[PDB]
Each structure stands twice: as structure tokens, then as C-alpha cells.
């Protein structure tokens, strides 16, 4: 009923284990030995420098994200490195600079010729942290061999207006800066890709060619996204209005609606005679082709004759 | 999609076995395999012509979705089951014991003529056993043909056999390393002269020898029987070769799954000591005691041979903890004449310590009932119990004046139980109770008791009081051999309780009660049971006194006779005229009062009696619609209850016109259906009963809901 | 129930919910992001966040399954020590009860299976990665678990002392000496072994145990 | 007391007159284990001693114990037999 901000970063339990009595060895009296220890429950002697109890952050370590490109990304102690698609020539530096300016981050030193720069203090906003941190970073772009990569080094961190030295926070915020830059670059790339996809209109020709399963499919000669987007409208034209759908699963369902002969010649290339029950449909992904599969309410698949009626045109509805 | 018989769960587990699982890769080459496998399954059930075809649709980012289109046909039905070569018996008799049915009678609508390969194999085994148990000793199934009509809905079965001749046992010859128990083994291999050979008898004899050896620590003997047949005179001589092996010792006894119960709580029920030679009977006794405890849903045993040791084993008891408790709670008034609340906390295993702790009470404007009870089942290592109980009940009417039937009681009780056998246990204890009644409405029974106590209260005015302090010696005896602790399926439990007022108490009397519950399974799986339950009670005064009317027995309710209002069976009150202490505007006063008549008109208020006897016959059946996974968490039964309560001291000579309450002939009866569910709040019992036999004044109540174990 | 927004938006929403502390919705978002994009730039981070959320959401079996999956799929991930520490924490959490904890019940007598598993996991973490930042807490938890397991053996030996099973008592205390020689429970149990030896009239063994006790009186 | 039922507390390993007679000095540890079975109790301290204790406590009937102590040398060869038939 009552909670506090700090339950988020601590372990589910209590610090009772910190009060356990220490282990002391047993002395063997002279003239006899003690039973030989199994060694199965022997605790190695380690160093007690790290945090214990509620002062330890079990929050998952921040792994650098390869968003802009699928190349290798890795962090080591205080620096993160992220390779990019090929090397982009000399455009990687201006792209990173523009993405940096997107967040109006201040820059003090500039080495455009050498592809290096430093950033002034930046403030972070995390609901996880009771007190907000802040620190400085250095961003450079250098070639790692056959490709050009971006590297970030976290100069220092500060919370509550005091310096920090824990590796957890350093890794967390180095990954934060790298992920921010990478997410900006990837957002630019995906916006460009979406614009290109929208510009590239695709044909709506339909076909009844089957596949390895042996059934006919209302194939459409287009990529998955566009045909999936236009299928609800086409199914609405034939009266099979969509009620449930799943873009990431392909499965979709329709409901019966009575359409007369005039309505069927209006759009939908005539009646397949599917006039009973809730039907389900599936789509495919073939960057130029797309298979549409129908199933009867009983759980069976439509025969070639059943769907050939719609295959007549099945193009204006889309 | 498309499957109407095979559930998605079984299919999904079948998928994982073949490597098809969400998040994994799609092995295309296995598609055909899986498909064929499923089709094979459909053919095993008899659903020929069924098809199972897989469709792989490509989803973006190099993913796929697997849809298994099932198109099942109509299941084939066994047209005939023929046995060729049976000259001693008849086909009808032989197949009557079969699981597969050639035909189903019109009355039987619970079975069908569906086919299954495993059932056919078991059926062949049953036929072989049938022919071998009659002494043939040569029965052989030459072949078995399973045919199928060309339309694939007429499966046929045929079995070609040879009976051979009937043999008799000449004598059992047992030899080998008998480990000095030869004399006790010759008694297990005793055969009657001229008795016919019998395979099941031989198997039972082998099992008996193995069990006999195991009781002495020989956990892993080998016993094989090789009968030598002699066709010259058709006689078979058994040859039982026995090798006891090594005597095994228990090294450690471990308990798993007792996340709540203390380890000692489970260890104290063990008859098998840890550092001692093994006894299989002792291990079984420990398992049975753990089951009878009732703290665990399931109990299993595992004797694991210690690696690298020919003499030592480890016994592991694996238990599944169960919710041992009830939390009955309710509110009756809310805002009418004040506020009220109830409590019902009852724990049989409190925090896994084994203690039985129960606290319950009711606070109203007129009642302040409170009751606490704490018992330690093991106050001594051997199992000596030490219980205790405190209760305080009050009735004041929230008027703080006269004519209110004030009744304040409170008492203590200490009990001490100890076993005498593995099943029997005695109990002895001391109790103290104080009862203070005041402003009692005159009635025949209560005034008779008061006169027996030497008091002479007025029959007209309500002004009166009575204080009694009673010290009682309590005794008891429980015989418990139930199969389980919460839903028994075998065995009987008998509980006798009683008390006698030791000299020095205000009133002298004695009381005794006797419960009984016997579970008899009819099905080998213990799914159909017959429960015979009964309860008896008798009490009476010792000297010239009489048993106090607040110790009377009450019957009728969800615990004694379902279908009647609680504590409604038995004698009814008869009120004398009051002619005083009457509230004209109240209108709640009974017939016998100033506002009403001036005779001993009989009322409908149950008062109970000093003698009680109730019986009940129940048929436990599986829940018609419930997943077998939750089979043991719900129980359905059909019950027929009988009950009667009478007052042996009722004077029929006087009050002749009024009903004679001393007659035990008036037996109420009821019949109906009951359902018990082990909910998070403990056992919940719903019951619908019709009281087809009832007498005047019996308030019926067909539907009843109860919290916690009825009995 | 999870929209099909681009991957970045889903990850941002999951991170925001995790920061806000709403474990259930963050878990749903992360499951959607993991089962929609199985092998992407988010795979490792999403798996780690799922482990953390399952732990904080008391979905311990799911946390164990996720930990096993991560360990087997990424045996050499740089942040693998964190996964081992989380497995130890999960096993230690399965060895706890809140209702009994409220009443101050010493649970050392209950099933030690999960305590043993947690000890194994923490020992693996400590030996494999001595320099990890979770090594000190792992060592402290190892000490506590060793004490608890010895107390369990002490409870069994004490019960058998009450029952009069002297051979069982001797064997249990010998096992304690071989397995947990340096715990306090073994020191407490030593007099039980001496008594068991005395009852069976083996006075030489009793004298030896008494000498051991005297040499370690404290 | 004497009326509370108590089960039999069998403790140790079973010993018989023939089995005890089957072991003689000079026997190897493996031969002794074969003849009598693996002991349930040895000396965990600095001695190679085997204890065959045979306890029976039927319950309110008295406890009877036979204890056979076998002392071996470092090589594992039996050196001393000490059979105690009953408690003192």
C-alpha cells in the first residue's frame, strides 16, 4: 500500500544474510586428525571492495546498441565502439554531427579534420535514479579496418553534485550516449527508408499460384507491408470486414456480409460462395510477391474452385 | 486449426519433441516427418482418412508462421471381434471382459465402439491371462488380424488362438539362496492337491516371496519361475528360483517439497530409522502415516541406490504441500441494530510447526462469543498430545434490564492424548465451565430440569436466575485408519468422546458421543466410493439431577442431516403462560403469554434432546465435468441422511395431548447432491437436499452453503 | 495487446515502464519486442531486461528459464557474471517465505534444495569471475547459505537425538564435520555426537569428541 | 509411561553368529566388507577402525546391543577383533 522510489533498484528480500556469523576453522587436538573436508562447500577468499546489501545495483548492465547498423558494437570499461554499414566514406562525421545537434548538445572542442570532438556537461532524466546524474563525453569517428566506426568515451559522471567512480554508472551512461547517437542515426535512416517505400508504389495484380503446401493462394505481386495494408480495404469491398488482425503474425479474420450480384460486379470480382461462418486469412513476405491463404470456418482450406471465383480480377478492390 | 478431438496442448507438446518450438528455426526437412507422425496418431485412434497438412507462411525479417490444418474424418467403429479356436469357452464370455466393445446395449450410453492399438494389446493380454488362469498353461495366440472396410469406417478384429489342454499343478519346488527364510517361504508356496495350474496365482506367489524378503532388508532379490510341462499326464511342476541378494541399509532419509512444513514434522512420522537395515514395510508405513497426516496433497517415495555401494540406499519422500486451513468470515447486521463481525481462522499446520490453532468468535450487540484452541500433536517424541481450549460466550440482549434471557458462559479445557497402537489413541483431560442463566422463558423441559436441580422458579413471571460451576473429566478414544487426510478413499475412522462431572460440581451428569466414517472403494482406481457415516450421543444425570439443557444434542444442518435448518430436528419447546413480563407492542412474545392464551400451547422452537442418532449413506463419484489435473481438489457425492433426537425424560403421562418427544421412532430423512471444493478459503461445501420425511415443526432448507470441514 | 509501433518506440516504452517500476507492463512490452524481433540489435539488452523484470515481478520460474536461455545462447557474453548472480538471487528467493518471515520463523528446518542450488550458483560465479562487481555480495550470501545448510543438518541430528537413533546422529554429525567444518552449527552439534557415542557405550570415540570440543571450547 | 505405544527403534547393521564367525585376523578390508557388509559407522579421526553396532529397542522391553570393533592397519589388513555381546 505504501512504496518508495528505491524499491526499483534493490533486491527482493532483506539484508538478513549480512548478519550471518563468520566462519571459523576448527582446531585439531594433538594425537588425532579431523575428518577430511569434502571441499564441495568451500568459499574462495575474494576481495570485499564491491557493494553489498541494498547498496548494490542489480539493474541490468547497459549494452551498447547497434541500431544504425548491424555491425559489431562493444563496450570496454569506459569506452563504447559501434561499427557502421561499410564506412559511409566521409559522410559519417557530418551525419553524427547533425544527429548530435538534434538534441542541442553543446560542443566545446572540435576536430572535424581529425574526426573528434568533446561535449559540455549534459543532464539526464531517469525515473529509476533518485538523483539525476551528469557528465562529459568525447565522440570520435575512426576506421577500424575496412569500415568506419564511432567511438565514445565517458570522461566522468556526477550525481548529487558529487563525483562518481562506480563502473556500473559509467557503463550505463556511456551506453546511454552511444544509444542516443545510434538511435538518432537509425531514425534518420528508417525515415529515409520509409519515404522511399512510400514513393515506390507497387502493382496490385493477383494470381492463384499455389506453393509447397499444395494449396492455391490469392497471391499479390507486392511486398508484405503494402499488400497487408491494402487487404483490409479489399476485404471490406467484398463485405468480409476485418475484425481481428496481427501484422507480425499474418493471421487475420473476417465476418460474413451479404452482397448481391450487382455488388459483386461492382467490386470483388464476384462471389466465391463463402457465405457462412468466420473466416481467417494469412499473408506472406516476398518483396515482390505475397500469398493470401483462406480457411473455412470448420478449420479447412478453400479449394481452388472456391477461390478461383474471386481471382477473376481481385484488383480494383485493393 | 481444424482439430475437433486432439487438443492444442497435446499437439503443442508433440511439436516440441520434434524441435518445432517458438523462437527456434524451421527445419523444413522435418515437416513431412511431423505431418506423418500426427497422421499416424489419428490412425492409432481409428480416425482413418484424416489428414494433417502444414502451411508455412513467410513473415518479414526472415520469420515464418506454422499453421497445422487438421481435417479429421469420422472415427471408425468396431464391427466385430472374432475369436477362432475357442472350444472350451464362448466368444461372448471372452470378449465381455474386453475393453474394446463389439456392440453397446441401448441402455449403456457411456461407451462406444472406438478402436485403439494400446487397448487392443491390453485386450490380448487380458485374453491370455483369462486362458492361463484356468490351468491351460499352453494357450497361444497364433495371430491377430485387424481388417478395415474399404470405406474405412468398419474396422474388424480377429484373434486366432489354440487352447491346448488343461494342466494341474503337481507341486512347487523352490530353491536357491533363500537367506535362511526357507521355512517362511514354504508357507507361501503351499498348493492344494490336484488344483489346476494358475498363472496369476504364480505371479502373486512370486510377489509375496519378494515382499517377504524385502521385509528383512533384501530390497533387490530376483525370483523367476520356469514351469516344466509334462504332457504325458498333463501336469506342471513349478520351479521357483530365488536369490535374496544383499541385505540393504538406509543411509539417509530425505524430504523434498516441504517448503512450509518443518523437517521434524515429516520425520516424526517415520517408522524406518535412518541408520538401520532397510524394511520396505516400514517405508510403506511411513508413507501411509504421512498421507494420513493430511498436510500434503501428494506423497511419493523413492528408494535410490547409493552410487558405488552394494549395501546402502537413500529413501526420499517427495511431498506436495496443501492449504491446511479455513478462514470463515461474514457480516450479518451491517447497520441494523448496530454492527457485527465474525472470524473463523482455523489452521491444522500453523506455520508448518504441526500445531493445530483455531480461533473464532462473533461480536454483536447482544453476543460476544470468543473461542481459542491450541494443540501440539507431539508434546512428546512418542506422539503424546497436549491440547487446550478457552471459550467465552455472552448473551445480554443489549437492554441492560430484566426479561432479557441473559446467558453468560465461559470455560477452560485441557486435554492429553497418547497412542496405544499404530491406529488407536486415547485422550484424558480436565474441563471447567461456568454458566449463568437469567430471565428464562418458562418451558416444560427447562423447568423440569430446574426442579431436578432443586430450584423452584415461578411459572408465570420471567424473573429468575441460575448459576452453575461444573468441573468435568473428559475422555476419548480415536481409531484412525483412513487412506488420506482430506478426501479419504478407503478405511474407517471412529471417534468416541465423553465427559463426566467429577464430585464437587454444581450439577452431576455424564455425556458421550460417538462418530464414525467408513470409506469403501468399489473401483480399483478408488474413484467411486461408498461412505457410511453415523453419529450417536447419549447423556443423563447421575443422582437426582438431570443433564443440563445447554448440553443437549442438536441435529439437522449441513453436518448432520442436510436439507434441514441448523439445529431444528428434535423436541420443540412448550411454553407456560406468563401473565407478566409481557411487552404488548413488541408482538414477538410466544403463544403462552399475557397477550396470548393461558395454556401450554406448543411452539416451534427447537430445544434439542439428551439422545441423538444420525446416519448417512453417500456415494462418491467423479466430477462429471472437470479436468483430471484438479480431480483431487473437488468431490461430488449423492447422499441419503437419516436423523432423530429425542428427550428420554419427557413425561408422556402428563401433557398427553402434546406430542410425545421421548419416541425415537420419528426419524427425519433427506436425499440430495453435495459438492465439496478445496478453495483458497478452505473446504467449501454446497448441497441441495429434499427432506422427503419430516415432522411438524421441522424447518426445511434445501440449499446449504458451509465453510470448513463438515466432518 | 501491444501495438506494432516501430522497434525503437517499443523499446523506449519498455524502458520508460521499467524506470517507472511497472513490472507487468514492461514485461509485456519486452516480450512483444523479443518475440517480434528474435535476432536484432535489441536481443541481448531485451533478454537482460526480461530477466531483471521477471526477478522483480516475482516470476521466478520465468527468470530461471530466461537465465538458462541467455547462458546457453551467449556463453561468453561480457555481462555473463551478472546473469549468474541473478540466477543465484532467484534460487535464494525461492528459499524464502513472507508469511513465515513476518512471524520470525527460522526456516532453516525447511527444504534446503533451493539453498543448495543458490550456493552452487554463487560458487560458480565467485570462482569463474573473481573480479566481478557482484563477488562480495556473492561471498556474503555464500557464507549465509553455508550457515543455513549446516543448521538444517543440525536440526536433523537434534531430532534423531530426541528419537534415540544414535547411529543416525553420529553419521549426521560426521557429515557436518566433513561438509561444514567451520560453521557454528557444527560446533553446536559436536556435543550431540559425544552423547550419541556415550549412549552406545563406545567410550573411546566419546573421549575423542570431548577432546575436540575442549580444544575448541569457544 | 509404559502405556504410550513406541515403535521399534532398530539401529546399526544386522549381525548374526555365523557372520561374526566368518571373519578372522589377517582379512583384508574388502573381504571383511564382503563377509559382513559395509559398516554404517567408522572412525572419522586418525584411525582405521570399523564399528559394527547392532541395536534393538522394541519399546518398553530393554535395549540390547552387540558391538563389534574391527581395527585395521594402514595397509587395510585386519589386526584386532573386539566382540562385545551385550551392554554393560
Residue numbers in the entry:
A (entry chain C): 25 to 342
B (entry chain A): 100 to 810
C (entry chain D): 26 to 243
D (entry chain E): 24 to 111
Lines quoted from the article behind this entry:
After their arrival in the periplasmic space, the OMPs are taken up by periplasmic chaperones SurA and Skp (seventeen kilodalton protein) and subsequently transported across the periplasm to the OM. The insertase for folding and insertion of OMPs into the OM is the essential OMP β-barrel assembly machinery (BAM). BAM is a multicomponent complex consisting of five different subunits, the integral membrane protein BamA and the lipoproteins BamB, BamC, BamD, and BamE, which are anchored to the inner leaflet of the OM. SurA bound to BAM can undergo a large swinging motion between two states.
Under these conditions, the BamA barrel is in the outward-open state. In this swing-in state, SurA and BAM form two key interaction interfaces: Interface I is located between the core domain of SurA and the polypeptide-transport-associated domain 1 (POTRA1) and POTRA2 domains of BamA. This interface is formed by full β strand complementation via backbone hydrogen bonding between the β sheet of POTRA1, specifically the β strand V75 to R79 and the N-terminal β strand of SurA (Q23 to V28). An additional prominent interaction includes a salt bridge between R64 of POTRA1 and D41 of SurA. Interface II is formed between the SurA core domain and BamB. It primarily involves hydrogen bonding between the SurA residues R404, E408, and Q155 with BamB residues Q276, Q230, and M226. In the outward-open conformation of BAM, a salt-bridge forms between D29 of BamD and R162 of BamA. In the swing-in state, this orientation is disrupted and replaced by a salt bridge between D29 of BamD and R271 of the C-terminal helix grip domain of BamC.
